[PDB]
Design a protein around this ligand. Structure first.
Ligand SMILES: [Mg+2]
Ligand SMILES: [Mg+2]
Ligand SMILES: [Mg+2]
Ligand SMILES: [Mg+2]
Ligand SMILES: [Mg+2]
Ligand SMILES: [Mg+2]
Ligand SMILES: [Mg+2]
Ligand SMILES: [Mg+2]
Ligand SMILES: [Mg+2]
Ligand SMILES: [Mg+2]
Ligand SMILES: [Mg+2]
Ligand SMILES: [Mg+2]
Ligand SMILES: [Mg+2]
Ligand SMILES: [Mg+2]
Ligand SMILES: [Mg+2]
Ligand SMILES: [Mg+2]
Ligand SMILES: [Mg+2]
Ligand SMILES: [Mg+2]
Ligand SMILES: [Mg+2]
Ligand SMILES: [Mg+2]
Ligand SMILES: [Mg+2]
Ligand SMILES: [Mg+2]
Ligand SMILES: [Mg+2]
Ligand SMILES: [Mg+2]
Ligand SMILES: [Mg+2]
Ligand SMILES: [Mg+2]
Ligand SMILES: [Mg+2]
Ligand SMILES: [Mg+2]
Ligand SMILES: [Mg+2]
Ligand SMILES: [Mg+2]
Ligand SMILES: [Mg+2]
Ligand SMILES: [Mg+2]
Ligand SMILES: [Mg+2]
Ligand SMILES: [Mg+2]
Ligand SMILES: [Mg+2]
Ligand SMILES: [Mg+2]
Ligand SMILES: [Mg+2]
Ligand SMILES: [Mg+2]
Ligand SMILES: [Mg+2]
Ligand SMILES: [Mg+2]
Ligand SMILES: [Mg+2]
Ligand SMILES: [Mg+2]
Ligand SMILES: [Mg+2]
Ligand SMILES: [Mg+2]
Ligand SMILES: [Mg+2]
Ligand SMILES: [Mg+2]
Ligand SMILES: [Mg+2]
Ligand SMILES: [Mg+2]
Ligand SMILES: [Mg+2]
Ligand SMILES: [Mg+2]
Ligand SMILES: [Mg+2]
Ligand SMILES: [Mg+2]
Ligand SMILES: [Mg+2]
Ligand SMILES: [Mg+2]
Ligand SMILES: [Mg+2]
Ligand SMILES: [Mg+2]
Ligand SMILES: [Mg+2]
Ligand SMILES: [Mg+2]
Ligand SMILES: [Mg+2]
Ligand SMILES: [Mg+2]
Ligand SMILES: [Mg+2]
Ligand SMILES: [Mg+2]
Ligand SMILES: [Mg+2]
Ligand SMILES: [Mg+2]
Ligand SMILES: [Mg+2]
Ligand SMILES: [Mg+2]
Ligand SMILES: [Mg+2]
Ligand SMILES: [Mg+2]
Ligand SMILES: [Mg+2]
Ligand SMILES: [Mg+2]
Ligand SMILES: [Mg+2]
Ligand SMILES: [Mg+2]
Ligand SMILES: [Mg+2]
Ligand SMILES: [Mg+2]
Ligand SMILES: [Mg+2]
Ligand SMILES: [Mg+2]
Ligand SMILES: [Mg+2]
Ligand SMILES: [Mg+2]
Ligand SMILES: [Mg+2]
Ligand SMILES: [Mg+2]
Ligand SMILES: [Mg+2]
Ligand SMILES: [Mg+2]
Ligand SMILES: [Mg+2]
Ligand SMILES: [Mg+2]
Ligand SMILES: [Mg+2]
Ligand SMILES: [Mg+2]
Ligand SMILES: [Mg+2]
Ligand SMILES: [Mg+2]
Ligand SMILES: [Mg+2]
Ligand SMILES: [Mg+2]
Ligand SMILES: [Mg+2]
Ligand SMILES: [Mg+2]
Ligand SMILES: [Mg+2]
Ligand SMILES: [Mg+2]
Ligand SMILES: [Mg+2]
Ligand SMILES: [Mg+2]
Ligand SMILES: [Mg+2]
Ligand SMILES: [Mg+2]
Ligand SMILES: [Mg+2]
Ligand SMILES: [Mg+2]
Ligand SMILES: [Pb+2]
Lengths: 210, 1119, 12, 158, 105, 95, 53, 164
């Protein structure tokens, strides 16, 4: 839930192509190549390799053995892949312990882990932004459809841990609920932040209706 | 009743005094009963010698020497009962002889100075601090010595550690990190271990070749030669390395401290620290800790040896030097005495600090008494330890066992120098050495686990707190009745064996029989078996050994059993279990429940209040019996005389019974016939159905005593009178308040009645305009005073039994300031077994009473006798304790056999022996049946059929013979008292010992409608009478948030707890018949906003269009 | 940086 | 500013910091008037500066103390917001409901899902106001105040 | 009257600190003992922050509700119960500036 | 459980909406006078110490017992916000 | 998760006619039979009833 | 130096008291009953005094301090509140106001409003209470309307249950 650096990382295959291995003494090496290019992969002594001299490995495929780091798989196979990975890898633990919960739930949360994106081609606020993805669906939507001059707002999918996801959100109210209140407010203040009461958390502090 | 018992491993030695730990510690501690001549000088006298020669010389005019002759305490201010009736802390005086010297003529000896009113110890082992008996709990920690522990992160080599307690004493570490440096740290930063040895004298050549030729690391030692070429100068150089910017010339000044007196010192010369050093590393230490002040040139037999073992620990195999910290010889247990001596010495330092200043202040010579001693420090210091020290708490005297177990309990949570809360995973586990030393099981269930633990039965803290346990010797194939109380460390050295080993006497009987080397189970031969285990009893605690067939219970659940007993509430009808382990007797005797006869004689008088026995020596003593006194926890403590008029007593025989003993035997419950089947779900998960027949007999009834109190306070509005005048409405309510004011003894007080009356003044400063008119209309003159009288709290009262009133002109009491006068009222009530109460057997079956059934219809036996309690079976498979099912069976036999048995822990009754007694029971149950005139039922035969189709009875055999088979199995045919028809299939029944557990203050069914409110935070608060509000936590918040409960969540925040204006209009609204007012803003919010405004920031709510909106309604706009 | 010393250094 | 016991008064720690700020500020003004050597004005402006930190947030540059008794941070204003001693944990640990109760539970076999057995005695307190009013609808009590006294003691309830 | 639909943190204009306020607490006079009352202008002073009684005033010139929003001729005290006194703000007028740690550090 | 809760659930587009209707119906069932009911004569509400629930026990047990029948009308914007309360007072007595 | 060896349950009172409406309509125990985690039934013949049946 | 301003006279006084308690802690082994303190201090010192003095000496404890088994329990939730009408008081005010208001209407204005406003509105003056009309019409009406108001309030008993 907090996409982090696992214990025994498995070097994923950034390239989709064919495999090639080698025997000198200290470190193994798995080569992935297409008629286009090849990429070297350092696989130290302890990495038991799952792949063989011979066939194809989709992008983000397990090359080493074991755990994978979400960011890498994201960068390689996409968001669609990280989500699907997060979900199943979680259910993995619950199933093995008898618990039988519906995937819907884990999805709902995972989704919030990727409800944020970065800005590399601006329009309104400068570029290393990192803001809510639909809020950009908003800008790009009216910037190309109702007011013109297509100012493509080019963004990058961004992956953040469940903690971080919430430690940095829309309403300041919600962020002051954490032990960072001192910072959360400073920023919120300076900028003239109208907290539109969207969530429940924020909306309860006020004693307002859910 | 007859007593049959089993298992025979010859219990070679009696248990020890169960309170030896507390008792002896406070004995050696304050060596009072013996003259200063007597030689035990540790503790008080020691802490006294330690800080008394105050050698102060010069910084103007000194040469001071205030000595110490002899410490002699003596005549207690008041006594024990007077100490609990009045609120005084029972403490013995203490004024030692003193004499200050002079550099001019004279040495004024102003003899006594009483400083220090130090608590005494009850004969059982507890204390009497303010009004509540208190107990000092022992502790555990690294025993001051030296160890070498693996290094932090670099998988490479391990370092050293020299451990000096007191805290104001250095903490050294030897670590070599070779591209160019070595690290020795007293306080924090390093320097060469060489610079230090050089100072003492160890020159490079001598050092390198004699200490480390075998050890290469020497190169790191001889490395910075420039400084190693100059000696005493190395002494000043190190001084230089420490830092202020100090004088390069204090002669033998600070090296002294790591040298001789206060910082290093493990308490006593010989065995406190040296044993640790000598058994673990290096060989000697002349001077307790590393210490000398004879020639100005220091001697350190400790500093080099620690490095010696590091150069050694870093190589091959001297021995193998790695210390499992948790070995009991390494984590030392702090007995009470040490805990009071430390606080006594801290205080001594505080005293001597201030005295030093008065050596300059007194003009010239009249300085002895007051000019050097002020008792303020000693008082605040010791008093603080007995009353506020985290290490001390309310004596848990729910019942005798609880007090006994609480007294002998160990905990690491302590001082600060010793272990805190981020720690625990390796301390909390049950280390190997924990054997006969600490029960595996006795620890708490939850957050505290492994941290607080109680020592095993035979375990004793010998000379310096290393838990030793019993072990008898076995020379060759011969086992002895001689016993060695062994330290946890020396036990590694030998091949020890378990009690359970066929023994012909001195002969071991089987070739391959088990022994357990240090920590690993091992099949040894009779010829290696050096030592054996005294008995199973030594492996666990006293609180656990009381469980019947412990062997058959999951250690996880036997824990619940042991803590269950500590919750045992004394029942008017005491009763020892139908089956006991063997410590019940010893528990009441060693705890101080029953009253025993000193020496043999005859009885003179037997009162409900006193037994004046006549010893044959020509003397007679009156033995009062604490009639109905109030335990710190409410349970009753009464000694009911068991001896008749004119009876020749056997020295050591019960004259009276303790709170819960039957006849000298512990009794925390009552034997009750029980059927173990399912009812109409009344005993659902863990619920128990009870037979009304149990209440008819005063069986599970327990006498409890609650104590309500009220004060006449002095307000500037006017004194609060305590008169029979309760202003506003009736005489009926006054009745029981009979004595003008206080409530009349023997009066039944129900919730709400006036227990004591009080009259305080109405407003804060001013009278009332509206209330002025009203009073005038019907009767202007009225008593303009408030009715603040101590009423009975919701929950319950009983019948007043005793009252206290400390009015003006006090006798020898301490009434607090403002306190005009106090009024205590003791109320007692018979708590009968009722639904909601919780009873549990010694195996962990802990359930709550769900239904009290009319004897009319619960399960009844073939012959009229009904069962008292019906236990659900489903609470036995999951949990693993077949032992309760083993007890019920043996119990069934005891009922028809009319006898009680004793089944030891690992060596006791066996399934075949049980089946044997049942066999004898069949004749009493069915034999009388045969003679009395009648045979078997339609029912009895019917259940047999379904039973043979079941597989419990060999088909073909006759019902007579069939039922015997079936009975031996532990079950008999029961008929449903409601229908009269059988319960298809045999059901087991029997005598099971079930206890009732104490009601904490939480059971008082809380329920709160409207009431007080906090001063600052505006949320619901209770206290005396109006129940406090329940908390609505985030976890609960999410519950509602999850559901669509929008208003329900809004109200929890607004109309119920914080909306000031809200709850107001809320009540009134509810009173007149309409929906509640919609929520006004939370005080939390408003409080938050201002909190936020106090800080430069500005929090303003906004509108639809960003525009104002107003939360603070009208009070912030201005003027 | 912890006050007393700065002032002391200042007027001293 | 509360009256605790006898003479013990008790105030919100903010008042000590506020006196801090106020005194310094005034001594500042007085020192500007009386004539101003430079070092002394600075030395004070410094002290005043720190004070102004204290009522906002103590501990960011060093920590203020009540005089010898408690080396305790005087709860600075954000502390009251963030809950630096675990006040936040308490805040979401819960507020207290006005109509609430608690008691031991016991299985009620014939009870239907739909219902639960709640002690009359507890019901009385919980639904007291609703009861009071109902008493007046009936002959039991003339009015609320009446109905209340009617229930103030146990032995008194018809 | 209108539902609160948007809350917003914005920085404090010194004039706004003053607009929110009443009086200037100019003296460290909490409460002087002989009379548990607010001392002089101090932190606890009825003008600056509010009355100390229900609908009543300090001196008593006006004591009932009728005069529900008016202030006293010789002494300042407007009133709803003690509650107004809680939600009101007063400001200290700093001599020479200092600044908010929250933004500076 | 409760009478035709399913039948009720089915009569609305959203679960949470049915709760809003009942509650608002219970509101006016009391306020404008408790005899603002569509179903009453033969077999409507009833509680047993006498058959006395006919007058004022539970408000919404009525609301539900009514909505379960086909006479009420719950819309998103059915009758203009302020004029509804006026007409209701004009027509329903008992205060 | 409640067994009867001593667990204590709290109890609250919904006041407004509204709070009462939601509480007995959508928050009633009989109405929340299936669990939010799995469609699987949460309320079923658990320990003693199975045994009987 | 203090949170509550005390004169220089009460300061020295406290010091003297303190110092006296010191001399008295020099020999009895009895932290003085405030009998000693009065004597040793001098002329007009008595028990009521020293008790008062030391009560003023103690410093304000913190409205925020660790409580009971030291945890999150802060001292302030414990202290009740007194001006605020706890729901039983708002309910009383309502009934008392409406019932008193009904009675006040069944009287005539002159001497009822006089004593109602004189008592209810301002400051609790027979003579000065009534306008032109002297004392004997005051008492006259005061006491005859006041009793008929009570005596029917006795019949339709609304007021008796003492609303305080
Ligand atoms: Mg190509
Ligand atoms: Mg590499
Ligand atoms: Mg392979
Ligand atoms: Mg990518
Ligand atoms: Mg895709
Ligand atoms: Mg894809
Ligand atoms: Mg499952
Ligand atoms: Mg860009
Ligand atoms: Mg970003
Ligand atoms: Mg466009
Ligand atoms: Mg376009
Ligand atoms: Mg942001
Ligand atoms: Mg933090
Ligand atoms: Mg609102
Ligand atoms: Mg017997
Ligand atoms: Mg007997
Ligand atoms: Mg025998
Ligand atoms: Mg026998
Ligand atoms: Mg033997
Ligand atoms: Mg023997
Ligand atoms: Mg000694
Ligand atoms: Mg006391
Ligand atoms: Mg001399
Ligand atoms: Mg330790
Ligand atoms: Mg130590
Ligand atoms: Mg290195
Ligand atoms: Mg130091
Ligand atoms: Mg040699
Ligand atoms: Mg070497
Ligand atoms: Mg050399
Ligand atoms: Mg130095
Ligand atoms: Mg010594
Ligand atoms: Mg060896
Ligand atoms: Mg502890
Ligand atoms: Mg420390
Ligand atoms: Mg371990
Ligand atoms: Mg337990
Ligand atoms: Mg041997
Ligand atoms: Mg022996
Ligand atoms: Mg071994
Ligand atoms: Mg052999
Ligand atoms: Mg266990
Ligand atoms: Mg366990
Ligand atoms: Mg024994
Ligand atoms: Mg005789
Ligand atoms: Mg006694
Ligand atoms: Mg005997
Ligand atoms: Mg019993
Ligand atoms: Mg009496
Ligand atoms: Mg009277
Ligand atoms: Mg008095
Ligand atoms: Mg029989
Ligand atoms: Mg018998
Ligand atoms: Mg058997
Ligand atoms: Mg026969
Ligand atoms: Mg016979
Ligand atoms: Mg009780
Ligand atoms: Mg109450
Ligand atoms: Mg709770
Ligand atoms: Mg509003
Ligand atoms: Mg205005
Ligand atoms: Mg005050
Ligand atoms: Mg506060
Ligand atoms: Mg203070
Ligand atoms: Mg806060
Ligand atoms: Mg923090
Ligand atoms: Mg707190
Ligand atoms: Mg709270
Ligand atoms: Mg039933
Ligand atoms: Mg039934
Ligand atoms: Mg029923
Ligand atoms: Mg009551
Ligand atoms: Mg005062
Ligand atoms: Mg004043
Ligand atoms: Mg003034
Ligand atoms: Mg300035
Ligand atoms: Mg139904
Ligand atoms: Mg339908
Ligand atoms: Mg009608
Ligand atoms: Mg019908
Ligand atoms: Mg009928
Ligand atoms: Mg109408
Ligand atoms: Mg649950
Ligand atoms: Mg439980
Ligand atoms: Mg509501
Ligand atoms: Mg349902
Ligand atoms: Mg679901
Ligand atoms: Mg679920
Ligand atoms: Mg389940
Ligand atoms: Mg003077
Ligand atoms: Mg005092
Ligand atoms: Mg608190
Ligand atoms: Mg209040
Ligand atoms: Mg007060
Ligand atoms: Mg009126
Ligand atoms: Mg006048
Ligand atoms: Mg006039
Ligand atoms: Mg009349
Ligand atoms: Mg009459
Ligand atoms: Mg009447
Ligand atoms: Pb005035």
């Amino acid at each position: 839930f907090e996409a982090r650096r696992p214990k025994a990382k498995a070097v994923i295959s950034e390239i989709d192509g064919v495999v090639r291995i080698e025997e000198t003494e200290e470190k193994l090496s798995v080569f992935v190549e297409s008629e286009g290019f090849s990429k070297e992969y350092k696989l130290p002594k302890e990495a038991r390799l799952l792949v063989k001299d011979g066939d194809y490995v989709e992008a983000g495929q397990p090359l080493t053995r074991g755990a994978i780091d979400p960011h890498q798989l994201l960068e390689a196979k996409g968001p669609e892949a990280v989500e699907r990975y997060l979900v199943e890898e979680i259910q993995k633990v619950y199933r093995a312990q008898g618990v039988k919960l519906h995937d819907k739930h884990i999805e709902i949360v995972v989704r919030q882990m990727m409800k944020y994106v970065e800005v590399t081609d601006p329009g309104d606020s400068r570029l290393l932004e990192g803001q809510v993805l639909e809020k950009w669906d908003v800008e790009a939507l009216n910037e190309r459809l109702i007011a013109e001059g297509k100012t493509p707002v080019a963004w990058k999918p961004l992956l953040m841990g469940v903690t971080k996801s919430a430690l940095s959100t829309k309403s300041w109210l919600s962020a002051a609920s954490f032990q960072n209140t001192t910072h959360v407010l400073t920023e919120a203040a300076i900028a003239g932040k109208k907290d539109e009461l969207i969530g429940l958390k924020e909306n309860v502090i006020l004693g307002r209706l859910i | 009743m007859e007593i049959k018992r089993f298992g025979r491993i010859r219990e070679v030695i009696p248990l020890p005094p169960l309170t030896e730990i507390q008792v002896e510690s406070y004995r050696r501690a304050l060596q009072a009963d013996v003259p200063p001549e007597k030689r035990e000088n540790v503790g008080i006298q020691a802490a006294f010698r330690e800080t008394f020669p105050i050698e102060e010389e010069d910084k103007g005019k000194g040469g001071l020497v205030l000595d110490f002759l002899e410490y002699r305490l003596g005549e207690p201010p008041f006594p024990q009962d007077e100490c609990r009736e009045k609120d005084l802390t029972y403490q013995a005086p203490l004024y030692a002889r003193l004499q200050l010297i002079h550099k001019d003529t004279g040495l004024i000896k102003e003899d006594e100075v009483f400083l220090g009113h130090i608590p005494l110890m009850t004969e059982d082992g507890s204390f009497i601090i303010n009004g509540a008996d208190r107990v000092i709990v022992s502790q555990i920690h690294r025993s001051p010595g030296v160890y070498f522990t693996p290094d932090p992160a670099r998988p490479g080599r391990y370092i050293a550690s020299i451990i000096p307690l007191p805290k104001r004493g250095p903490w050294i570490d030897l670590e070599v990190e070779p591209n160019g440096v070595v690290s020795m740290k007293v306080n924090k930063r390093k320097f060469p271990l060489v610079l230090l040895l050089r100072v003492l004298g160890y020159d490079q050549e001598t050092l390198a070749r004699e200490l480390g030729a075998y050890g290469e690391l020497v190169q790191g030692l001889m490395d910075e030669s420039v400084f190693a070429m100059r000696p005493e100068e190395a002494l000043i150089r190190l001084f230089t390395l420490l830092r202020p910017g100090d004088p390069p010339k204090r002669d033998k000044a600070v090296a002294y401290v790591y040298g001789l007196i206060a910082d290093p010192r493990r308490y006593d010369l010989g065995e406190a620290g040296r044993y640790k050093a000598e058994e673990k590393l290096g060989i000697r230490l002349s001077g307790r800790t590393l210490a000398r002040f004879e020639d100005g040139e220091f001697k350190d037999e400790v500093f080099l040896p620690t490095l010696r073992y590091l150069f050694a620990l870093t190589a091959g195999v001297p021995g193998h030097e790695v210390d499992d910290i948790d070995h009991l010889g390494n984590r030392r247990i702090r007995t009470v005495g040490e805990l009071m001596t430390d606080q006594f010495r801290v205080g001594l330092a505080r005293l001597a600090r201030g005295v030093r200043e008065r050596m300059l202040m007194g003009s010239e010579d009249s300085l002895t008494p007051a000019k050097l001693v002020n008792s303020r420090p000693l008082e605040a210091a010791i008093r603080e330890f007995f009353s506020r020290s985290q290490l001390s708490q309310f004596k848990d005297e729910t019942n005798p066992l609880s007090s006994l177990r609480h007294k002998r309990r160990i905990s690491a949570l302590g001082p600060g120098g010793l272990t805190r809360e981020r720690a625990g995973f390796d301390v909390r586990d049950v280390h190997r050495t924990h054997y006969g030393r600490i029960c595996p099981v006795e620890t708490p269930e939850g957050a505290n686990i492994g941290l607080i633990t109680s020592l095993a039965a035979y375990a004793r803290v010998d000379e310096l707190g290393f838990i030793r346990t019993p072990y008898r010797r076995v020379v060759g194939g011969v086992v002895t009745d001689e016993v060695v109380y062994m330290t946890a460390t020396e036990e590694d050295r030998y091949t020890i064996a378990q009690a359970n080993t066929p023994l012909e006497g001195n002969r071991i009987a089987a070739e391959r029989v088990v022994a357990r080397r240090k920590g690993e189970p091992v099949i040894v031969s009779p010829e290696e078996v050096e030592f054996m285990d005294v008995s199973p009893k030594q492996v666990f605690s006293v609180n656990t050994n009381l469980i019947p067939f412990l062997e058959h219970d999951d250690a996880n659940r036997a824990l619940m059993g042991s803590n269950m007993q500590t919750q045992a509430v004394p029942l008017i009808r005491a009763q020892a279990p139908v089956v006991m382990t063997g410590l019940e007797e010893r528990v009441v005797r060693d705890s101080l429940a029953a009253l025993y006869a000193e020496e043999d004689g005859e009885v003179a008088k037997v009162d409900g209040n006193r037994i004046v026995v006549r010893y044959e020596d020509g003397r007679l003593v009156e033995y009062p019996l604490r009639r109905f006194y109030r335990s710190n926890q409410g349970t009753a403590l009464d000694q009911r005389p068991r001896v008749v008029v004119g009876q020749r007593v056997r020295k050591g025989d019960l004259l009276a019974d303790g709170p819960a003993s039957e006849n000298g035997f512990l009794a925390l419950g009552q034997n009750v016939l029980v059927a173990i089947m399912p009812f109409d779900g009344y005993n659902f998960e863990d619920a128990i159905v009870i037979s009304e027949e149990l209440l008819k007999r005063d069986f599970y009834t327990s006498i409890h005593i609650e104590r309500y109190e009220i004060e006449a306070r002095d307000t500037k509005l006017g004194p609060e009178r305590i008169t029979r005048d309760i202003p506003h409405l009736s005489e009926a309510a006054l009745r029981d308040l009979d004595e003008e004011g206080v409530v009349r003894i023997g009066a039944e007080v129900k919730p709400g009645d006036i227990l004591v009356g009080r009259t305080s003044f109405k407003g804060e400063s001013e009278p009332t305009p509206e209330e002025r008119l009203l009073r005038s209309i019907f009767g202007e003159k009225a008593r303009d005073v408030k009715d603040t009288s101590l009423r009975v709290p919701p929950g319950e009262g009983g019948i007043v039994v005793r009252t206290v009133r400390l009015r003006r002109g006090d006798p020898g009491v301490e009434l607090k300031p403002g306190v005009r006068e106090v009024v205590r009222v003791y109320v007692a009530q018979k708590r009968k077994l009722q639904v909601g109460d919780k009873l549990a057997n010694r195996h962990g079956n802990k359930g709550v009473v769900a239904k009290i059934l009319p004897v009319e219809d619960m399960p009844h036996l073939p012959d009229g006798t009904p069962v008292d309690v019906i236990l659900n079976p489903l609470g036995v498979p999951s949990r693993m304790n077949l032992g309760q099912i083993l007890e019920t069976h043996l119990g069934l036999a005891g009922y028809f056999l009319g006898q009680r048995y004793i089944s030891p822990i690992f060596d006791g009754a066996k399934e075949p022996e049980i089946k044997e007694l049942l066999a004898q029971a069949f004749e009493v149950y069915f034999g009388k049946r045969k003679g009395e005139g009648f045979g078997v039922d339609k029912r009895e035969v019917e259940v047999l059929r379904r039973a043979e189709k079941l597989g419990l009875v060999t088909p073909g055999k006759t019902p007579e013979e069939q039922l015997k088979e079936l009975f031996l199995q532990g079950k008999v045919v029961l008929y449903d008292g409601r229908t009269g028809e059988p319960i298809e299939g045999p059901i087991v029944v029997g005598q099971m010992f079930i206890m009732k557990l104490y009601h904490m203050v939480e059971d008082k069914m809380h329920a709160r409608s409207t009431g007080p409110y906090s001063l600052i935070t505006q949320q619901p608060l209770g206290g005396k009478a109006q129940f406090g509000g329940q908390r609505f936590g985030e976890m609960e918040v999410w519950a509602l948030e999850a559901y669509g409960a929008a208003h329900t969540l809004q109200e929890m925040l607004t109309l119920k707890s914080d909306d000031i204006e809200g709850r107001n209009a809320a009540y009134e609204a509810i009173i007149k018949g309409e929906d509640v007012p919609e929520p006004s803003v939370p005080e939390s919010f408003r409080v938050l906003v201002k909190e936020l405004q106090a800080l430069a920031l500005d929090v303003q709510t906004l509108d639809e269009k960003d525009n104002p909106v107003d939360i603070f309604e009208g009070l912030a706009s201005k003027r | 940086k912890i006050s007393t010393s700065d002032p002391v250094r200042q007027y001293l | 500013m509360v009256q605790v016991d006898g003479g013990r008064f008790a105030t919100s720690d903010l008042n000590d910091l506020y006196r801090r700020l106020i005194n310094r500020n005034n001594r500042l003004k007085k020192l500007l008037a009386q004539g101003a050597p430079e070092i002394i004005i600075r030395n004070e402006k410094r002290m005043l500066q720190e004070a102004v930190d204290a009522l906002l947030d103590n501990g960011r540059r060093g920590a203020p103390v009540t005089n010898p008794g408690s080396d305790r941070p005087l709860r600075s204003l954000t502390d009251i917001l963030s809950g630096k001693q675990g006040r936040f944990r308490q805040n979401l640990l819960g507020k207290r409901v006005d109509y609430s109760g608690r008691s031991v539970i016991v299985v009620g076999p014939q009870l239907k899902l739909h219902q639960c057995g709640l002690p009359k005695r507890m019901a009385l307190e919980l639904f007291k106001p609703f009861l009071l009013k109902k008493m007046e609808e009936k002959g039991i009590a003339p009015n609320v105040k009446a109905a209340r006294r009617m229930l103030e003691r146990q032995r008194d309830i018809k | 009257k209108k539902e609160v639909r948007k809350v917003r943190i914005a920085l404090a204009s010194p004039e706004k600190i003053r607009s929110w306020s009443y009086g200037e607490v100019e003296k460290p006079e909490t409460i002087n003992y002989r009379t548990l009352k607010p001392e002089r202008d101090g932190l606890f002073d009825e003008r600056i922050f509010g009355p100390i009684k229900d609908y009543e005033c300090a001196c008593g010139k006006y004591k009932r509700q009728r005069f529900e929003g008016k202030v006293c001729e010789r002494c300042g005290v407007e009133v709803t119960k003690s509650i107004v006194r809680r939600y009101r703000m007063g400001h200290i007028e700093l001599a020479t500036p200092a600044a908010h740690i929250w933004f500076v550090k | 459980a409760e009478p035709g809760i399913d039948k009720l659930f089915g009569m609305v587009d959203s679960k949470y909406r049915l709760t809003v209707v009942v509650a608002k119906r219970a509101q006016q069932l009391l306020r404008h006078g408790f005899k603002n009911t569509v179903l009453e004569p033969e077999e409507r509400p009833k509680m047993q110490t006498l058959e006395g629930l006919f007058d004022d026990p539970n408000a919404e047990t009525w609301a539900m017992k009514e909505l379960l029948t086909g006479r009420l009308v719950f819309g998103e914007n059915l009758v203009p916000e302020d004029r509804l309360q006026k007409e209701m007072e004009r027509i329903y007595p008992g205060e | 998760n409640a067994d009867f060896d001593g667990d204590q349950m709290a109890v609250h009172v919904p006041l407004s006619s509204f709070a009462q409406a939601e509480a007995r309509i959508q928050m009633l125990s009989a109405h929340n039979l299936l669990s939010p985690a799995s469609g699987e039934p949460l309320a079923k013949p658990s320990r003693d009833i199975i045994l009987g049946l | 130096a203090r949170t509550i301003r005390i004169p220089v006279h009460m300061v020295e006084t406290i010091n003297k008291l303190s110092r006296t308690a010191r001399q008295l802690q020099q020999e009895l082994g009895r932290e003085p009953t405030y009998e000693e303190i009065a004597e040793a201090m001098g002329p007009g010192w008595d028990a009521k005094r020293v008790e008062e003095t030391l009560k003023i000496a103690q410093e304000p404890v913190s409205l925020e301090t660790p409580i009971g088994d030291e945890k999150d329990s802060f001292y302030g939730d414990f202290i009740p509140d007194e001006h605020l009408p706890s729901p039983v008081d708002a309910a009383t005010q309502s009934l008392l106001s409406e019932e008193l208001e009904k009675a006040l209407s069944k009287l005539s204005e002159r001497e009822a409003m006089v004593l109602k406003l004189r008592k209810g509105l301002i400051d609790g003056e027979e003579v000065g209470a009534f306008f032109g009309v002297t004392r004997e019409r005051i008492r006259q009406i005061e006491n005859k309307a006041l009793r008929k108001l009570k005596y029917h309030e006795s019949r339709t008993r609304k007021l008796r249950d003492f609303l305080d």
